[PDB]
């Protein structure tokens, strides 16, 4: 009855979506050729008799990764024209992705979204995958979000952004692109989850003892997190939460809507046998500083709202005992105006492990989403970098020649200053 | 979808282009006959960037050849891999430049540009949409420099929104090759600084040293140096032909590297470079490549990076490797050598990864840097120009074709302004 | 006599090399099929493929890949013949070898399964209507050969 539409933009979005869709197929038992040898209607449609097609859209200006997906194994699954490409990419240029190249393809993307929404009856909302530091993943994502907000508005919108790391960073104009896209999407987004690459590298190394991790492993972890998020809609449990109540429980202020995700427990087969994974133990482990997936130290901030999504063989009495112990713990401190800050959801479907992966099979899992004030330090560092580059007016001529004025840079700087001031005021 | 057209001019340009086409045709598994003899379907998925189909399974390179004498054209036509070039793409004159910039740029260029432009326009319109241009020439030549400058001006006048990549050689610091090297070098630089987008500088002393020491080849012939330059070219352009983990095309590199419109001179590098014998006693891994790229002896431009500060560094990796190792190596090299990087710009390193290693190896990388050490080259060129121009030596060969002292003064002023800019951005 | 294993290994190596160029093989098949019309009946025999070769189809690479496929077929036939030379379950497995490698034999409905994913790389229409059997012929023969060797030893 309830349906969700996923949109993947850019290389990172396309690859993460590919991983999560193969995980979805494995969980639901649908063969890669589309033939299944009654609860999959949320993500999979029906084509006449015996064929199931996913409800997703893949968008990228460059045709390389989309062509690889079309040629790959999952070609008898995706609709032939649900995959949209172009000729030239944005190439780390927000102006190119926002003004010049995307305006001849946003119309087609919107037409396909409308056609997909026509099929559904109980549409819930959209999930958008992109990256802040990429030209297309910033500009085209902002354009698509503004067009969707204009067209529909009422339906909720959620994002899974890859937050650039403070130290391990790839491109050079990432602060410019991130500042511009944040200033554009602050007024249109509803709740944007945050993950990072260096944090996941550290988690993978320290826990699974893998010397040479890779993007495939990172995308598998992200797909596990997304599946844990959507399990409440996909299956039925003792206490399930939908996509509408997430924003209400996690967003206390109109512009403070930047939570972060956490997953536990993550271990390998060698440590799986010599360990007793209990509800209290995993709940305690989910709070340690060296387990979250955003590179920041939680003792520099205070928690505001925490969402717990237990998954598998879970007992409410020991869940409540673990929550009470965590509340009694003195090292973790909360904000004064939030007497109650816990949302608990339980599902009866144990996590599913992809064969040949680096994740051992378990019985319980905890996915945690936290809204905290520690993001102020990250925003401070990012705008300090922006100011340092913009003092000399470097790399500005590309944006100027593509159709942008320095007024946009000034306005974005002012908006980020205002947001940092809002965080500083709210923290006390 | 992304078509690249290649332009050649002069003796050095023609020879380097022949070697480059040989290497590229080897990469895609195309025999000198003209028929596909590959082994995987990945090789012909993107054969449209550099080749055109014709009749039954015959691929012809999309190249234009320009010269004033039929000598090197006949030599390359009678040599190996000479039966794949289109016979209609050989354009040549009859007189010759004779190491004169004025003759190439004012006298015979006028009668050659019409035909070469007609051919280039036909090749450009043959496709659906272009991506950019490439050019291999010599700054210090007589016909290559003038003809390439005139062509660059014409194309930039006609196609004003496409990238232009030039792979030009530069005068050697120790021993020159022509007496009038600084005049042509200065005029070519003055035109290139304004009519291009990114220029890669290559020397000959660096290639001589590399071929003498790394491969212990006691007979360094131009074939080997041209092969090295072609390998660098392929390493630069490989991302537009094969899938990878983190793609990065030419426009992406241009956006990420050049911060100011006039600071667009790069100097490349390559890795690994090991001998035939000592190859057995070395472990080929990512740390070895990271150690090898950041060295003065492994670069193809005769300059010392220790004398200047790096602005932006772009490294393109090929083969199967982990992103974590690359990230840790780049962070380590940026953190332990903070004295060699500018501070007002953070994250001086851009990384790209492909998945098809070069034939005969397992993993390789290409280094491209934009440093402040080009000021030494430009300062030496300007000093030589002033020293010769004070006595008006060899100048009567230029005024006899249409030149004037004003052009020389303006070119010297432009060099002084550019070197002052590089000095003051330090 | 524990001596045809080398021939089997060479055959499977060449089959792997051909499986890499499967896509070009399908393109050549489609081009020659369009050139020779008869587009209402899917491929049913190897002799039909040989006739499509003999018909003017050109394009060089098409002839190369089709010649490679026919060479694999000929070597498989030779192996079916020689396994009896080197000497009930083995008998009817060899009978299946002979009857499948025989040129005059319907192969439109032939299919392969796990671990062979050759049919997953085809588009829906071609997989269910045109080229289901041709790409699924060699792996079945190789599996039969390995099973027969397993019974023999």
């Amino acid at each position: 009855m309830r349906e969700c539409i996923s949109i993947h933009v850019g290389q990172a979005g396309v690859q993460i979506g590919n991983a999560c869709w193969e995980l979805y197929c494995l969980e639901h038992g649908i063969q890669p050729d589309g033939q299944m040898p009654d609860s999959f209607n949320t993500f999979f449609s029906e084509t006449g008799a015996g064929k199931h097609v996913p409800r997703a859209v893949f968008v990228d200006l460059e045709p390389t990764v989309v062509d690889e997906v079309r040629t790959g194994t999952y070609r008898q699954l995706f609709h032939p024209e649900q995959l949209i490409t172009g000729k030239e990419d944005a190439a780390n240029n927000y102006a190119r992705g926002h003004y010049t190249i995307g305006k001849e393809i946003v119309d087609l993307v919107l037409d396909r979204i409308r056609k997909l929404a026509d099929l559904c009856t109980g549409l819930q909302g959209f999930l958008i995958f992109h990256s802040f530091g990429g030209g297309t993943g910033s500009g085209f994502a902002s354009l698509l979000m503004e067009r969707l907000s204009v067209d529909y508005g009422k339906k909720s919108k959620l994002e899974f952004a890859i937050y650039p790391a403070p130290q391990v960073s790839t491109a050079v104009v990432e602060p410019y692109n991130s500042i511009l896209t944040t200033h554009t999407t602050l007024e249109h987004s509803d709740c944007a989850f945050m993950v990072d690459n260096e944090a996941i590298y550290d988690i993978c190394r320290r826990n699974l003892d893998i010397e040479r991790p890779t993007y495939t492993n990172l995308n598998r972890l992200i797909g596990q997190i997304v599946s844990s998020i959507t399990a409440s809609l996909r299956f039925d449990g003792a206490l399930n939460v939908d996509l509408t109540e997430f924003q209400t429980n996690l967003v206390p202020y109109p512009r403070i809507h930047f939570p972060l995700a956490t997953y536990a427990p993550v271990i390998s087969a060698e440590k799986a046998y010599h360990e007793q994974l209990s509800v209290a133990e995993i709940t305690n482990a989910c709070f340690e500083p060296a387990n979250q997936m955003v590179k920041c130290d939680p003792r520099h901030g205070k928690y505001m709202a925490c969402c717990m999504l237990y998954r598998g063989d879970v007992v409410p009495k020991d869940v409540n005992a673990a929550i009470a112990t965590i509340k009694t713990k003195r090292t973790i401190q909360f904000v004064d105006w939030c007497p109650t800050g816990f949302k608990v959801g339980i599902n009866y479907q144990p996590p599913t492990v992809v064969p040949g992966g680096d994740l051992a099979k378990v019985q319980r899992a905890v996915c945690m989403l936290s809204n905290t004030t520690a993001i102020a330090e990250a925003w401070a560092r990012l705008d300090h970098k922006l100011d340092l580059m913009y003092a000399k007016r470097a790399f500005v001529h590309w944006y100027v020649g593509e159709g942008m004025e320095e007024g946009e840079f000034s306005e974005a700087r002012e908006d980020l200053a205002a947001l940092e001031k809002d965080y500083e005021e709210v923290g006390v | 979808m992304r078509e690249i057209v290649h332009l050649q001019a002069g003796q050095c340009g023609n020879q380097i282009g022949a070697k480059f086409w040989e290497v590229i045709s080897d990469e895609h598994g195309i025999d000198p006959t003209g028929t596909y003899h590959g082994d995987s379907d990945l090789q012909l998925e993107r054969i449209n960037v550099y080749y055109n189909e014709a009749t039954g399974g015959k691929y012809v390179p999309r190249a234009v050849l320009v010269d004033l004498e039929p000598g090197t054209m006949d030599s390359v036509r009678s040599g190996p891999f000479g039966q794949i070039f289109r016979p209609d793409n050989f354009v040549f004159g009859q007189s010759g430049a004779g190491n004169n910039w004025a003759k190439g740029h004012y006298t015979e260029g006028a009668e050659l540009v019409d035909s070469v432009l007609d051919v280039v326009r036909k090749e450009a319109e043959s496709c659906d949409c272009l991506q950019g241009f490439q050019l291999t020439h010599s700054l210090g030549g007589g016909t290559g420099s003038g003809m390439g400058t005139l062509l660059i001006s014409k194309i930039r006048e006609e196609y004003p929104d496409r990238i232009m990549n030039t792979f030009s050689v530069v005068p050697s610091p120790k021993v020159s090759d022509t007496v009038v090297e600084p005049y042509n070098a200065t005029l070519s630089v003055h035109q290139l600084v304004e009519n291009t987008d990114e220029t890669y500088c290559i020397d000959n002393e660096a290639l001589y040293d590399i071929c003498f020491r790394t491969l212990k080849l006691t007979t360094p012939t131009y074939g080997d140096l041209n092969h090295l330059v072609s390998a660098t070219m392929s390493g630069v352009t490989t991302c537009l032909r094969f899938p990878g983990q983190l793609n990065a095309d030419l426009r992406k590199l241009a956006v990420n590297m050049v911060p100011f419109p006039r600071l667009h001179f790069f100097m490349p590098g390559f890795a690994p470079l090991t001998s035939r014998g000592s190859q057995q006693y070395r472990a080929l891994t990512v740390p070895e490549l990271t150690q090898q790229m950041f060295d003065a002896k492994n670069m193809m431009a005769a300059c010392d990076p220790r004398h200047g500060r790096y602005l932006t560094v772009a490294a393109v990796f090929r083969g199967r490797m982990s992103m974590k190792e690359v990230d840790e190596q780049m962070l380590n090299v940026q953190n332990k050598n903070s004295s060699y990087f500018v501070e007002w710009i953070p994250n001086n390193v851009k990384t790209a990864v492909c998945d098809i290693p070069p034939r005969g190896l397992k993993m390789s990388a290409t280094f491209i840097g934009n440093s402040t050490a080009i000021q030494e080259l430009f300062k030496r060129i300007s000093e030589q120009f002033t020293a010769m121009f004070r006595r008006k030596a060899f100048l009567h060969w230029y005024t006899g074709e249409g030149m004037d002292e004003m052009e020389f003064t303006e070119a010297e002023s432009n060099m002084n302004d550019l070197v002052s800019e590089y000095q003051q951005y330090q | 006599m524990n001596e045809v294993k080398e021939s089997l290994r060479s055959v499977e190596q060449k089959y792997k090399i051909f499986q890499q160029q499967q896509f070009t093989f399908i393109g050549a098949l489609e081009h020659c099929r369009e050139n020779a019309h008869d587009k209402i009946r899917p491929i049913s025999s190897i002799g039909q493929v040989q006739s499509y070769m003999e018909h003017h189809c050109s394009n060089s690479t098409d002839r190369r890949i089709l010649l490679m496929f026919l060479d694999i077929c000929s070597e498989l036939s030779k192996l079916c013949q020689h396994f009896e030379a080197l000497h009930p379950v083995t008998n009817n497995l060899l009978e299946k070898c002979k009857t499948l490698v025989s040129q005059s034999n319907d192969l439109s409905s032939l299919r392969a399964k796990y671990p062979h994913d050759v049919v997953n790389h085809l588009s829906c229409d071609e997989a269910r209507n045109h080229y289901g059997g041709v790409v699924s012929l060699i792996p079945i023969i190789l599996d039969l050969m390995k099973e027969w060797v397993a019974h023999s030893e």
């Binding site: 590919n18 193969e22 494995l26 038992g29 063969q31 890669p32 040898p37 690889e68 790959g72 194994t73 999952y74 890779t214 495939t216 599913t352 992809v354 064969p355 040949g356 | 598994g29 590959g38 082994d39 995987s40 990945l42 899938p243 983990q245 199967r320 998945d355 098809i356 290693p357 034939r359 005969g360 | 796990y114 671990p115 994913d117 997953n120």
Partner: peptide, 20 residues
């Protein structure tokens, strides 16, 4: 020199068996 090069995508997303 033989060519034994294949992309990381094809060697990772192999057709896994369907669970019961």
């Amino acid at each position: 020199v033989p060519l034994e090069d294949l992309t990381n995508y094809k060697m990772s997303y192999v057709a896994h068996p369907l669970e019961k």
